[PDB]
C-alpha cells in the first residue's frame, strides 16, 4: 500500500493563529493532473467529515479558512484562523492505489486563558445505598490547562483502589476540559467512614481545591 505519514501527531494552537499539518506519501499520489489526496476532519463522537478533496478543493460547506495544498508526495493542510470549533483530529487519505489508506491522524487543540475548575461532589444516591452499593462522584468541570491531579481522601487517608476517572475531549465552544472521578465502595465500608473529600491540584489555585462532605 501507499503509506501516509502525518506530522505532527498532536498540535496546540491559539485562537486566530495558523495550524499547519503535513502528509507525506511513500509514492506519488498524482495521476493525470489530479492529486488523489483528501483531508478528513473527525470530532469526538462523530463520523469523519470530508474537509478537502483532490488536495486543494473545499468540501461541501467547508469555509475557506481550511486550505489544502501540495502535490506528488508532500501535502499540507492549513487552518487559518483557528477557531474554537476546529479542535479535532485531522486525517489525510489517498485514493491513488488499488488499496486506499489513511494517515495516522493529527490531533489539533486550542490554547486559551487559564480557567479554574468548578468542583462538585455527590454522596451515594438513596437508590444505590438501598441496593447494597455506594459510589461517591466528583465533577471537575471547565478548566484549563488540562493538566490536573485528583485524589480521594477518606478520613484523611488517600484512597486509590476503586477510583474510576474519565476526561472529556476539549470543549468545542470554550476550549476547556472536564473530568469525572467516581469512587466505588461497598455500602458496608461507606457506612464506617465519616468524611469523603474530592481534592484536586491545578495551577489556577495555590492550595488544594477541596469539596467534601461529613457524615453524621
Amino acid at each position: 500500500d501507499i503509506v501516509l505519514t502525518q506530522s505532527p501527531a498532536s498540535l496546540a494552537v491559539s485562537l486566530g493563529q495558523r495550524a499547519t499539518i503535513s502528509c507525506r506519501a511513500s509514492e506519488s499520489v498524482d495521476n493525470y493532473g489530479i492529486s488523489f489526496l483528501n483531508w478528513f476532519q473527525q470530532k469526538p463522537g462523530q463520523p469523519p467529515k470530508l474537509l478537502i478533496y483532490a488536495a486543494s478543493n473545499q468540501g461541501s460547506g467547508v469555509p475557506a479558512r481550511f486550505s489544502g495544498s501540495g502535490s506528488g508526495t508532500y501535502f499540507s493542510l492549513n487552518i487559518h484562523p483557528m477557531e474554537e470549533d476546529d479542535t479535532a483530529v485531522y486525517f489525510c487519505q489517498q485514493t491513488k492505489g488499488v488499496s486506499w489508506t489513511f494517515g495516522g491522524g493529527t490531533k489539533v487543540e486550542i490554547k486559551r486563558a487559564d480557567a479554574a475548575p468548578t468542583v462538585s461532589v455527590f454522596p451515594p444516591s438513596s437508590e444505590q445505598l438501598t441496593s447494597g452499593g455506594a459510589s461517591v462522584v466528583c465533577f471537575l468541570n471547565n478548566f484549563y490547562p488540562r493538566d490536573i491531579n485528583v485524589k480521594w481522601k477518606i478520613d484523611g487517608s488517600e484512597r486509590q483502589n476503586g477510583v474510576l476517572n474519565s476526561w472529556t475531549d476539549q470543549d468545542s465552544k470554550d476550549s476547556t476540559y472536564s473530568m469525572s472521578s467516581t469512587l466505588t465502595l461497598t455500602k458496608d465500608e461507606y457506612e464506617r467512614h465519616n468524611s469523603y473529600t474530592c481534592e484536586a491540584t491545578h495551577k489556577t489555585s495555590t492550595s488544594p481545591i477541596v469539596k467534601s462532605f461529613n457524615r453524621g
Binding site: N38, P48, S99, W100, T118, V137, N165, S178
Partner: protein, 222 residues
C-alpha cells in the same frame, strides 16, 4: 439529500461472524462505490474495502482479505459487510461511506453514523442509573450542578440525555470507563440556582443492547 443509515450495535462471541448493513438514499445507488472504514476505540481510521453495487465489483485491503466480505442488494439499496472468525481485535466502530468521482479525488463525501461492534464472550448487562442530587452544604449558590451515574453495564454504547434532550446546555457527558468487565459513565448538568428544584430535571439513559430506556428524576436530598 444523500443519507447513509447503518444498522445498530452488535455483540458477538469470539470466532463467530457478524454482518452490518448500510442503507443508502438520495442518489443512484448502483453507480457509486461504497467503502467501509474501521476505527478501534481511541485509534485512527483504517480502510477495509469497497464495493460497486452495479456489478458487485469489490476491492479489499490486503489486511482484510479473507475476513471481510462485502455484498450489495440493489432492491433495498443496502450494502453489507460480513466479518468472520471474530477476535477482540475486531471490536470497533465501522463506518460506510460513498466515494465521489475521479475529478473529486474519489473522496468519501457522505458517511454513515457508524456501527459499534463488540466481540467478547461476556453477556449483556443493563446499566444501573442513579441520580446525583447536590449536598445540603452548597447554599445552592449562583448555579447548581446535578449528576447522573450509569454504573455496571456491558456492552457499549449508551445514550444519555437530560429532560429528553431539551436540556443540552451546561451538560458534560463523560467517556465510559471499563472496569472488571463492566462500563461506567457519568453526566453532569449545571443550571441556575432558581431553576432547580422548582423546574423538573431528569436524566434519560438508553442501552440498546438491553432494550432499556430509563428515566431518573433529580429530587433534593431530604
Amino acid at each position: 439529500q444523500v443519507q447513509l443509515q447503518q444498522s445498530g450495535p452488535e455483540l458477538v462471541k469470539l470466532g463467530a461472524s457478524v454482518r452490518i448493513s448500510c442503507k443508502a438514499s438520495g442518489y443512484r445507488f448502483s453507480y457509486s462505490w461504497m467503502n467501509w472504514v474501521k476505527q478501534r476505540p481511541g485509534k485512527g481510521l483504517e480502510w477495509i474495502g469497497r464495493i460497486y453495487p452495479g456489478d458487485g465489483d469489490t476491492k479489499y485491503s490486503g489486511k482484510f482479505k479473507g475476513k471481510a466480505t462485502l455484498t450489495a442488494d440493489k432492491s433495498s439499496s443496502t450494502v453489507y459487510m460480513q466479518l468472520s472468525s471474530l477476535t477482540s481485535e475486531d471490536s470497533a466502530v465501522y463506518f460506510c461511506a460513498r466515494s465521489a468521482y475521479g475529478s473529486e479525488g474519489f473522496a468519501m463525501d457522505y458517511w454513515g453514523q457508524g456501527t459499534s461492534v463488540t466481540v467478547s464472550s461476556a453477556k449483556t448487562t443493563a446499566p444501573s442509573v442513579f441520580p446525583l442530587a447536590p449536598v445540603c452544604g452548597d447554599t445552592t449558590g449562583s448555579s447548581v450542578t446535578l449528576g447522573c451515574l450509569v454504573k455496571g453495564y456491558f456492552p457499549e454504547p449508551v445514550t444519555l440525555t437530560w429532560n429528553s434532550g431539551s436540556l443540552s446546555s451546561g451538560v458534560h457527558t463523560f467517556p465510559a470507563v471499563l472496569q472488571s468487565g463492566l462500563y461506567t459513565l457519568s453526566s453532569s448538568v449545571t443550571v441556575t440556582s432558581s431553576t432547580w428544584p422548582s423546574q423538573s430535571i431528569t436524566c434519560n439513559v438508553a442501552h440498546p443492547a438491553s432494550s432499556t430506556k430509563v428515566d431518573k428524576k433529580l429530587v433534593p436530598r431530604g
